[PDB]
C-alpha cells in the first residue's frame, strides 16, 4: 500500500515542451499521460535512493525504504517530491 501511494504521489501532472518555435524556447505547458507518470515515479524513487547510498556508509536498502516512506507521506524532504515540484513550477511558468 505504501508503495502504490508513493508511486501515486510521485509523478508529475504537468510538463513543458518545445513546440512554439519562434527561435527561442517558446515552451508550452501540456498534460501528462498516466503511464509516463508511473514510470517517472519509479525512476525517481530509485534514483534518489541511489544518490544517497553512494560513498555513504549506509546501505542501499535503508535509503530505499526512507525514500518510499517520505514520498508516501507527501513530504517534500524526499528527492521525488522535489523533482515533481520543480517540473510543475517550470511548467506553470510556461503555461
Amino acid at each position: 500500500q505504501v508503495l502504490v501511494d508513493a508511486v501515486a504521489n510521485s509523478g508529475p501532472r504537468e510538463d513543458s515542451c518545445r513546440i512554439g518555435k519562434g527561435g527561442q524556447v517558446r515552451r508550452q505547458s501540456v498534460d501528462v499521460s498516466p503511464l509516463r507518470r508511473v514510470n517517472i515515479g519509479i525512476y525517481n524513487i530509485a534514483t534518489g535512493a541511489r544518490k544517497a547510498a553512494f560513498r555513504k556508509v549506509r546501505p542501499f536498502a535503508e535509503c530505499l525504504a526512507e525514500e518510499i516512506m517520505n514520498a508516501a507521506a507527501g513530504a517534500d524532504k524526499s528527492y521525488a517530491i522535489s523533482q515533481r515540484n520543480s517540473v510543475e513550477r517550470i511548467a506553470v511558468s510556461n503555461r
Binding site: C17, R18, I19, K21, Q28, V30, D31, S33, R95
Partner: protein, 60 residues
C-alpha cells in the same frame, strides 16, 4: 484552481514538432460533458483519465 480529472474519447494525431505531442479530445465526466481539445505528451489511449490543472484552457 482545484485540478479536475478528464476522460479521453478521441485522439486526433500528433504534431510536427519532432512528433512527441498528441492532440486529444476530452470530456468532463464530473457532469459538464465539455468536449474540448488539449495537448498531451506520452502514450495515450482511449478511456484514459487525464488530470487537468486548468478548467479553462484550449489548444489548436
Amino acid at each position: 484552481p482545484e485540478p479536475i480529472n478528464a476522460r479521453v474519447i478521441e485522439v486526433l494525431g500528433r504534431t510536427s514538432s519532432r512528433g512527441g505531442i498528441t492532440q486529444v479530445k476530452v470530456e468532463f465526466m464530473t457532469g459538464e460533458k465539455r468536449q474540448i481539445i488539449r495537448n498531451v505528451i506520452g502514450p495515450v489511449r482511449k478511456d484514459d483519465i487525464l488530470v487537468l490543472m486548468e478548467s479553462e484552457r484550449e489548444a489548436r
